[PDB]
Write a structure and sequence with these properties.
This protein has 6 helices and 7 strands. By secondary structure, the protein is an alpha/beta fold. The protein has one domain. Strands 1-2-7-6 form a 4-stranded mixed sheet, sandwiched between helices. The protein has a 3-stranded mixed sheet with strand order 3-5-4, covered by helices on one side. The structure holds N-(6-methoxypyridin-3-yl)-N'-thiophen-2-ylurea (VZM). N-(6-methoxypyridin-3-yl)-N'-thiophen-2-ylurea (VZM) binds next to helix 1 and helix 2. It catalyses: Thiol-dependent hydrolysis of ester, thioester, amide, peptide and isopeptide bonds formed by the C-terminal Gly of ubiquitin (a 76-residue protein attached to proteins as an intracellular targeting signal). It is a multi-pass membrane protein. This is Papain-like protease nsp3.
């Protein structure tokens, strides 16, 4: 199972790790993707998870979008986890760099509550432009299910742990 995670709360754990490498090792039931509404997995966690699936995630996502249209900011969809997980929960956190509403971050994390356990990144952090300390705070105050957070950046990981209230 998940190893080397620091316990933050009863249900939130954190580790300085590459979510692609964590997913290939654990093969969790659910890996969360930091998706956009179009499921265009270009960069950040999305680009990395998609590249690990040899673009199979993007092919499946384009078929999903062709059928269903775009997701909502704060929304999600469950697709295959390919070689990474049983399922991938594609969750759209607000992208502050695209001028999206930061209040939608709590709605985005609510999607995690539909799954007992998840391997996940911090939503809206990194290239999405939100403050990762705020994202972790919203995560621990919103998610009630077991969430194993993988934070790629070591310095950010240390900052998150040392400032956690
Ligand atoms: C948040 O941005 C990222 C970017 C990259 C990553 N992981 C990777 O790229 N992993 C790779 C495995 C093998 C070859 S490259 C995670 N997070």
């Amino acid at each position: 199972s998940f190893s080397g995670y620091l316990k933050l709360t009863d249900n939130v754990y954190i580790k300085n790790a590459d979510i692609v490498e964590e997913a290939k090792k654990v093969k969790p039931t659910v890996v969360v993707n930091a998706a956009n509404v179009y499921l265009k997995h270009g960069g950040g966690v999305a680009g990395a998870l998609n590249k690990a699936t040899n673009n199979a995630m993007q092919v499946e996502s384009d078929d999903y979008i062709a059928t269903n249209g775009p997701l909502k900011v704060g929304g999600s969809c469950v697709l295959s986890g390919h070689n990474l997980a049983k399922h991938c929960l594609h969750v759209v956190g607000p992208n502050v760099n695209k001028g999206e509403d930061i209040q939608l971050l709590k709605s985005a994390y609510e999607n995690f509550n539909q799954h007992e356990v998840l391997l996940a990144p911090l939503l809206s952090a990194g290239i999405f432009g939100a403050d990762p300390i705020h994202s972790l705070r919203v995560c621990v105050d919103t998610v009630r299910t077991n969430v194993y957070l993988a934070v790629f950046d070591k310095n950010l990981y240390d900052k998150l742990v040392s400032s956690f209230l």
